[PDB]
Amino acid sequence: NKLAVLYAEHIATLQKRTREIIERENLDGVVFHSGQAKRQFLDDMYYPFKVNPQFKAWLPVIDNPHCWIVANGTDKPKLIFYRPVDFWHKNEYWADYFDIELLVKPDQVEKLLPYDKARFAYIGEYLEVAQALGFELMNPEPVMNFYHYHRAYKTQYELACMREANKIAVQGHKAARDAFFQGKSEFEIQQAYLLATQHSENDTPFGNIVALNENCAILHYTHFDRVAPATHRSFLIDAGANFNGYAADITRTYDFTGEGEFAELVATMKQHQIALCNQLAPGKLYGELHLDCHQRVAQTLSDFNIVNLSADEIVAKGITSTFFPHGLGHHIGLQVHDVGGFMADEQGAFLRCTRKIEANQVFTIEPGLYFIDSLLGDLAATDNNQHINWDKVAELKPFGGIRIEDNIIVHEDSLENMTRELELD
């Protein structure tokens, strides 16, 4: 197993990071709580389990509640593994790096936790549970900030997991793309994606966005239309995948016919998107790229005669935000919108990323151009009304909008666009 070799280095890195912070904050150790199952109100049914990101940072156990990791960075990390033996229920490489204790029932954990928890930092969601167990330090900000800062630097093990994540997601994206050109409904396209990725809905790192025509302009679109539209014009799919707790996050936009103004508009955004990806470089502030994206959107708006102005004028008047209202992208890893994106240092001192770009960091680059009713209405109420080609806006509105998103690893002397290296056009 190639992962096993890399994982040995991963643990050693986390141990080193753990040593530094527990010594700095004068702690005996850190306790990571995987989480618990949430029960639905007045019911005996449960929400799907979502593991604490700080927990799965150590190991690929993301489907098991009531698990505990006790670490100080010097000794082997203690893993309290939940494993019920009741009759209604029911070894790998990472197992050898932990001292594993089996937990048969949730409230039996206290006998397995350290006796004096005065200087053990509880890292988890369930503060009432932590207090009941005797923990007093819960998610200490210096500790959270330290881990979150270094989470931006992915180990070789993590990079491998994120590559496999894209690989699965790209398979889904190609299958979804094929379903679109066959005239399938949003629901059917989603089924094709889930089938190709072999993912259940709750396996996807975020709710898939599967939008046809006007629905493409809906930034937080979640629904899946069961009925295919009479006419197929555009398709926007924002979807990813999971591998070992690590996420992919990819968006592609398609014109149905492959020709016409919207088809050219998509391709223009593509060339801009690729150009923005290749601007990723160590020592460079991510905010610089976001600014350049606005320039490129303004040029696009100008070239396609959507706004009757030059690119620089569109930027100065603040018109671009009407068509591109969100951030250029974000760090990605264990979390889709990964932590540490705003941090200037370990202490912890719209756009989701402003942090200086360094090697071993992973980003998304997702420029967008949309025709959104409420935003266009606001623009029409300003003095910029005169500058807008409203006829052109009316022409492109039925196509909804455009977003193109890749996941890129930044290396010291090169860039690794995982998504496009997997040949997803």
Q: Which residues are annotated as a binding site for Mn(2+)?
A: 238, 249, 330, 366, 405
β 99-103/137-138 pair status: unpaired
Least separation in angstroms between residue 206's CB and its own copies is: 6
Rule CB under 8 A: say whether 401 interacts with its own copies: no
Handedness of CA 210, 212, 217, 223 (dihedral sign): negative
From the list Mn ion, its own copies, none, partner contacted by residue 206 (C-beta under 5 to 8 A by kind):
its own copies
Cα atoms in the 13 Å half-sphere on the side-chain side of 113: 27
Rule CB under 8 A: say whether 274 interacts with its own copies: no
Rounded CA gap, 171 and 193, in Å?
8
Name which of 284, 58, 79, 233 is nearest 151 in CA terms: 58
Residue 331 CB coordination number (10 Å): 24
From the list Mn ion, its own copies, none, partner contacted by residue 249 (C-beta under 5 to 8 A by kind):
Mn ion
Rule CB under 8 A: say whether 349 interacts with its own copies: no
Name which of 242, 164, 157 is nearest 206 in CA terms: 242
Q: Which is nearer to its own copies, 41 or 115 (CB)?
A: 41
CA distances from 65 to 83, 229, 247 (A): 10, 42, 20
Rule CB under 8 A: say whether 89 interacts with its own copies: yes
Judged by CB under 8 A, the stretch of 99-107, 195-203, 311-319, 410-418 that binds its own copies is 195-203
Kindly provide the b/e burial profile for residues 65-102, where b requires at least 16 CB atoms within 10 angstroms of the residue's own CB. Answer: bbbbbbbbbeeebbbbbbeeeeeeeeeeebeebbeeee
Least separation in angstroms between residue 166's CB and Mn ion is: 12
Q: Which is nearer to Mn ion, 83 or 352 (CB)?
A: 352
Binding-site string for its own copies from residue 321 to residue 340, where x marks contact by CB under 8 A and - marks none: ----x---------xxx-x-
From the list its own copies, Mn ion, none, partner contacted by residue 23 (C-beta under 5 to 8 A by kind):
Mn ion
Yes or no: say if 83 and 102 are a contact pair by the CB < 8 Å rule.
yes
Which of 42, 230, 349, 381: binder of its own copies (CB under 8 A)? 42
Least separation in angstroms between residue 251's CB and its own copies is: 15
Residue 151 CB coordination number (10 Å): 23
Rounded CA gap, 17 and 72, in Å?
10
Handedness of CA 203, 125, 23, 81 (dihedral sign): negative
Binding site for Mn ion (CB under 5 A): 23, 26, 238, 249, 251, 303, 364, 405
Judged by CB under 8 A, the stretch of 38-46, 154-162, 171-179, 235-243 that binds its own copies is 38-46
Rule CB under 8 A: say whether 291 interacts with its own copies: no
Chain-centroid distance, C-alpha 149: 16
Rule CB under 8 A: say whether 90 interacts with its own copies: yes
Rule CB under 8 A: say whether 54 interacts with its own copies: yes
Least separation in angstroms between residue 416's CB and its own copies is: 25
Rule CB under 8 A: say whether 350 interacts with its own copies: no
Rule CB under 8 A: say whether 359 interacts with its own copies: no
Least separation in angstroms between residue 63's CB and Mn ion is: 22
Residue with tokens 């102005």: 309
Name which of 350, 94, 393, 125 is nearest 261 in CA terms: 393
Q: Which residues bind its own copies (CB under 8 A)?
A: 35, 38, 40-45, 47-48, 50, 52-54, 85-90, 124-125, 144, 187-188, 190-191, 194-195, 198, 200-202, 205-206, 215, 218-221, 224, 226, 325, 335-337, 339, 372, 374-375
